[PDB]
Enzyme design. Structure first.
Site, PDB file in Angstrom:
ATOM      1  N   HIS A 299      30.709  -7.489  -0.223  1.00 57.41           N
ATOM      2  CA  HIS A 299      30.533  -6.694   1.335  1.00 57.41           C
ATOM      3  C   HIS A 299      31.921  -6.520   1.822  1.00 57.41           C
ATOM      4  CE1 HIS A 299      29.963 -10.571   2.919  1.00 57.41           C
ATOM      5  NE2 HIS A 299      30.124 -10.161   4.037  1.00 57.41           N
TER       6      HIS A 299
ATOM      7  N   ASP B  68      26.352 -10.175  -4.212  1.00 54.19           N
ATOM      8  CA  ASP B  68      27.468  -9.995  -3.202  1.00 54.19           C
ATOM      9  C   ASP B  68      28.676 -11.099  -3.984  1.00 54.19           C
ATOM     10  OD1 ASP B  68      29.210  -9.484  -1.006  1.00 54.19           O
ATOM     11  OD2 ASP B  68      28.091 -11.097   0.153  1.00 54.19           O
TER      12      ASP B  68
ATOM     13  N   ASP C  69      26.830 -24.229  10.517  1.00 55.25           N
ATOM     14  CA  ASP C  69      26.833 -23.002   9.627  1.00 55.25           C
ATOM     15  C   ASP C  69      28.021 -22.139   9.421  1.00 55.25           C
ATOM     16  OD1 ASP C  69      25.117 -19.946   9.614  1.00 55.25           O
ATOM     17  OD2 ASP C  69      25.718 -20.939   8.049  1.00 55.25           O
TER      18      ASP C  69
ATOM     19  N   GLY D  20      32.943 -13.938   9.969  1.00 53.01           N
ATOM     20  CA  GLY D  20      34.345 -13.910   9.486  1.00 53.01           C
ATOM     21  C   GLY D  20      34.762 -14.737   8.447  1.00 53.01           C
TER      22      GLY D  20
ATOM     23  N   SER E 216      32.976 -14.741   5.444  1.00 52.02           N
ATOM     24  CA  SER E 216      32.497 -14.121   4.214  1.00 52.02           C
ATOM     25  C   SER E 216      33.602 -14.338   3.210  1.00 52.02           C
ATOM     26  CB  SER E 216      32.435 -12.686   4.600  1.00 52.02           C
ATOM     27  OG  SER E 216      31.243 -12.649   5.491  1.00 52.02           O
ATOM     28  N   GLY E 217      33.071 -14.314   2.001  1.00 53.11           N
ATOM     29  CA  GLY E 217      33.919 -14.229   0.752  1.00 53.11           C
ATOM     30  C   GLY E 217      34.498 -15.742   0.548  1.00 53.11           C
TER      31      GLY E 217
HETATM   32  C1  LIG Z   1      21.797  -9.021   6.166  1.00 56.84           C
HETATM   33  O1  LIG Z   1      22.782  -8.831   5.616  1.00 56.84           O
HETATM   34  C2  LIG Z   1      24.126  -9.120   6.200  1.00 56.84           C
HETATM   35  C3  LIG Z   1      24.210  -9.690   7.429  1.00 56.84           C
HETATM   36  C4  LIG Z   1      25.353 -10.092   8.031  1.00 56.84           C
HETATM   37  C5  LIG Z   1      26.619 -10.399   7.120  1.00 56.84           C
HETATM   38  C6  LIG Z   1      27.828 -10.776   7.774  1.00 56.84           C
HETATM   39  N1  LIG Z   1      28.590 -12.040   7.271  1.00 56.84           N
HETATM   40  C7  LIG Z   1      28.047 -13.220   7.268  1.00 56.84           C
HETATM   41  C8  LIG Z   1      28.371 -14.433   6.573  1.00 56.84           C
HETATM   42  C9  LIG Z   1      27.571 -15.715   6.750  1.00 56.84           C
HETATM   43  C10 LIG Z   1      26.665 -15.643   7.560  1.00 56.84           C
HETATM   44  C11 LIG Z   1      25.973 -17.298   7.807  1.00 56.84           C
HETATM   45  N2  LIG Z   1      26.311 -18.065   7.163  1.00 56.84           N
HETATM   46  N3  LIG Z   1      25.218 -17.380   8.607  1.00 56.84           N
HETATM   47  C12 LIG Z   1      26.080 -14.549   8.204  1.00 56.84           C
HETATM   48  C13 LIG Z   1      26.652 -13.400   8.276  1.00 56.84           C
HETATM   49  C14 LIG Z   1      28.565  -9.638   8.265  1.00 56.84           C
HETATM   50  O2  LIG Z   1      28.597  -9.188   9.627  1.00 56.84           O
HETATM   51  N4  LIG Z   1      29.446  -9.397   7.474  1.00 56.84           N
HETATM   52  C15 LIG Z   1      29.940  -7.924   8.109  1.00 56.84           C
HETATM   53  C16 LIG Z   1      29.266  -6.743   7.710  1.00 56.84           C
HETATM   54  C17 LIG Z   1      28.062  -6.495   7.755  1.00 56.84           C
HETATM   55  C18 LIG Z   1      27.232  -6.106   6.721  1.00 56.84           C
HETATM   56  C19 LIG Z   1      27.988  -5.682   5.487  1.00 56.84           C
HETATM   57  C20 LIG Z   1      29.396  -5.599   5.184  1.00 56.84           C
HETATM   58  C21 LIG Z   1      29.994  -6.162   6.362  1.00 56.84           C
HETATM   59  C22 LIG Z   1      26.595  -9.918   5.830  1.00 56.84           C
HETATM   60  C23 LIG Z   1      25.357  -9.364   5.362  1.00 56.84           C
HETATM   61  O3  LIG Z   1      25.239  -8.853   3.968  1.00 56.84           O
HETATM   62  C24 LIG Z   1      26.347  -8.893   3.248  1.00 56.84           C
END
Ligand SMILES: COc1ccc([C@@H](Nc2ccc(C(=N)N)cc2)C(=O)NCc2ccccc2)cc1OC
Ligand SMILES: *[C@@H]1O[C@H](CO)[C@@H](O)[C@H](O)[C@H]1O
Ligand SMILES: *[C@@H]1O[C@@H](C)[C@@H](O)[C@@H](O)[C@@H]1O
Ligand SMILES: C[As](C)(=O)[O-]
Ligand SMILES: [Ca+2]
Ligand SMILES: [Ca+2]
Ligand SMILES: [Ca+2]
Ligand SMILES: [Ca+2]
Ligand SMILES: [Ca+2]
Ligand SMILES: [Ca+2]
Ligand SMILES: [Ca+2]
Ligand SMILES: [Ca+2]
Ligand SMILES: [Ca+2]
Lengths: 142, 188, 251
Positions: free
Chosen positions: C41, C90, C183, C187, C189-190
């Site tokens: 994502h 993902d 948690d 930011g 992610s990945g």
């Molecule tokens: C329900 O699905 C999502 C929600 C939030 C995130 C969220 N990332 C994220 C990462 C980790 C956690 C957590 N540890 N609670 C929390 C958030 C996010 O905002 N990414 C930005 C964006 C949103 C959706 C798609 C692409 C980019 C990712 C999700 O799916 C990949």
């Protein structure tokens, strides 16, 4: 027990329950009180659950109220010490004791492997680095 | 494959056995912040001796789960802190000496599955000041009691007259299973 | 990261930083000199696939030192089963344009073997997630690399213990606390989810998603790396195809 004319003799906990096997009444004929006779009877008649010599592999049996407890020697576990610890050399058991990768082998003993950049030592379970920067290590801590 | 149910702990003097229903599994035991350790690999029994794992730290609270095989299907057991839940076996009167008017009644320091060095610790070694013994003696129609911080009683008896005794291990602080069953009866 | 601490400079040598047109984008994990593992994502809204940069040995985003090694991303591979905007599968495998130099501040995290990861690593209770993400659900990103220690849960428990959104598939697992104290966060992610076992660290997770960040009654969800080992391995031994984006079949 009650021999001929033995009941003519007064009650004796020793002679009748210790020296002999006494029934409930005979017992009640000693303590008289029911609550007392019961407290005594409960154990006296429980029976030594260890009689069957349940504990194995050099275990030691300890009788209990309608049960027993086994005290095993180091290399054994289980309700009856029926478990050999030295025979759990499989990969699901603490990674087969391998430092890195473990490989089960039907019948024979298990094998231990390493990740690239690592080599399996003669001990058969350890892996040492073969490169200057093997994955998974933090240089400033090594 | 049906997830195991009704998981129960059977522990006496620290000899802990986890039992379950119904009647091939693998059990894992851990502590709130520890790694999971597999035990009783692929057993066909509906039980697993976890004594050795829990005697490593009786004060700890352990949690166990049972995986079912024909992530796998499992079930969690109740939490179990040995030191506060293990059952006190049935005590035993080791001996009783009389010196005139007084009588010394002794309770055997039964052994526990808890190991240290090359020997099994006794009920005293593990609980110390936490464990006291209750004496229930009698002649007369009534009953009398006595308590001790150690493993011996020193009571006053009416000269001549015959008595009977029965002790019972007790760990006062305990909320559950604070009293062990009564020992066998012994009379002078 | 939420409720963690600053990874001392060097104690997170596989942590990678992804930038698009010179802009923080996501975290990554170096699994060898030329391959980086990150989240799918993360590339959902990319446009200039020729402006992707990977930075190793990074720590303080506000200072530059000789330990920084930037690299352009030649190829970004994603499972063809992945759907942008969604959560399952993902994972992304990024090939660098040029190998990096392994130093004291740049060392790869190991990719484990499937069974070792499923049968052993999976049961080491704690692991470390890191990155330069948010320090608070609402707040902003962090200047110094942050790290945190989180416990892993089996999907079943994660569900019972979670408040009633995507389902926890078999391609993800939960790790974290539900009290709202710690948690990983968006930011992040990945970023990696590295497990420590008998002296060596392995890659067992990828900061994927969640219900906000450190929300009461919720855990973090990480991609289950162990389900993509073979996948990643085949790809790493495959010839470099045209175009930055490459949707590979999975299985
Ligand atoms: C329900 O699905 C999502 C929600 C939030 C995130 C969220 N990332 C994220 C990462 C980790 C956690 C957590 N540890 N609670 C929390 C958030 C996010 O905002 N990414 C930005 C964006 C949103 C959706 C798609 C692409 C980019 C990712 C999700 O799916 C990949
Ligand atoms: C020995 O006797 C005990 C006590 O009843 C029994 O439980 C065992 O199975 C037997 O071997
Ligand atoms: C009882 O204790 C066990 C542990 C072994 O030492 C036996 O030999 C003994 O009878
Ligand atoms: C199942 As959840 C991501 O709400 O903890
Ligand atoms: Ca008789
Ligand atoms: Ca008689
Ligand atoms: Ca006699
Ligand atoms: Ca006789
Ligand atoms: Ca009669
Ligand atoms: Ca009689
Ligand atoms: Ca009679
Ligand atoms: Ca008995
Ligand atoms: Ca920097």
């Amino acid at each position: 027990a009650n021999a001929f004319l033995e009941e003519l003799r007064p009650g004796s906990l020793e002679r009748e329950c210790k020296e002999e096997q006494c029934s409930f009444e005979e017992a009640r004929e000693i303590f008289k009180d029911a609550e007392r006779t019961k407290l005594f009877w409960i154990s006296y008649s429980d029976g030594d659950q260890c009689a069957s010599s349940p504990c194995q592999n050099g275990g030691s049996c300890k009788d209990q109220l309608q049960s027993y407890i086994c005290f095993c020697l180091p290399a054994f576990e289980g309700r009856n010490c029926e478990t050999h610890k030295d025979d759990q050399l499989i990969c699901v058991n603490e990674n087969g004791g391998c430092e890195q990768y473990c490989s089960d082998h039907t019948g024979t003993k298990r094998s231990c492997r390493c990740h690239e950049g690592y080599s399996l030592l003669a001990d058969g379970v350890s892996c040492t680095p073969t490169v200057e920067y093997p994955c998974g290590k933090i240089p400033i801590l090594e | 494959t049906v997830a195991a149910y009704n998981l129960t702990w059977k522990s006496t003097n620290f000899k802990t056995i986890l039992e379950w229903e119904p009647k091939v599994y693998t059990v894992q035991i851990s502590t709130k912040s520890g790694d999971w350790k597999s035990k009783c690999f692929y057993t066909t029994d509906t039980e697993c001796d976890l004594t050795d794992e829990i005697v490593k730290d009786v004060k700890q609270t352990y949690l166990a789960r049972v995986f079912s095989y024909p992530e796998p299907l499992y079930e969690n057991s109740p939490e179990f802190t040995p030191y506060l839940e293990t059952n006190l076996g049935q005590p035993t009167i080791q001996s009783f000496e009389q010196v005139g008017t007084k009588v010394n009644v002794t309770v055997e320091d039964e052994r526990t599955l808890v190991r240290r060095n090359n020997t099994f610790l006794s009920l005293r070694d593990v609980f110390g000041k936490d464990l006291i013994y209750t004496l229930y003696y009698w002649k007369s129609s009534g009953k009398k009691t006595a308590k001790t911080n150690t493993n011996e009683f020193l009571i006053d008896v009416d000269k001549g007259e015959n008595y009977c005794f029965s002790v019972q291990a007790v760990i006062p602080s305990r909320t559950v299973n604070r009293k062990s069953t009564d020992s066998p009866v012994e009379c002078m | 990261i939420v409720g963690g601490k600053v990874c001392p400079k060097g104690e997170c040598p596989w942590q990678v930083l992804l930038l698009v047109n010179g802009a923080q984008l996501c975290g990554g994990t170096l699994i060898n000199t030329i391959w980086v593992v990150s989240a799918a994502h993360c590339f959902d809204k990319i446009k200039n696939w020729r402006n992707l940069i990977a930075v190793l040995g990074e720590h303080d985003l506000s200072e530059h030192d000789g330990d920084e090694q930037s690299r352009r991303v030649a190829q970004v591979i994603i499972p063809s089963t992945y759907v942008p905007g969604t959560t399952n599968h993902d994972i992304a495998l990024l090939r660098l344009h040029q190998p990096v130099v392994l130093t004291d501040h740049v060392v790869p995290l190991c990719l484990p073997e499937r069974t070792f990861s499923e049968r052993t690593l999976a049961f080491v209770r704690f692991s470390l997630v890191s990155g330069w993400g948010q320090l608070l659900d609402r707040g902003a990103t962090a200047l110094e690399l942050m790290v945190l220690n989180v416990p892993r849960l089996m999907t079943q428990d994660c569900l019972q213990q979670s408040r009633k959104s995507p389902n926890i598939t078999e391609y993800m697992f939960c790790a974290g606390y539900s009290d709202g104290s710690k948690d990983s966060c968006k930011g992040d992610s990945g970023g990696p989810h590295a497990t420590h076992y008998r002296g060596t660290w392995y890659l067992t997770g990828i900061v994927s998603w969640g219900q906000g960040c450190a929300t009461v009654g919720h855990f973090g969800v990480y991609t289950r790396v162990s389900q993509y080992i073979e996948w990643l391995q085949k790809l790493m031994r495959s010839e470099p195809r045209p175009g930055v984006l490459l949707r590979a079949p999975f299985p």
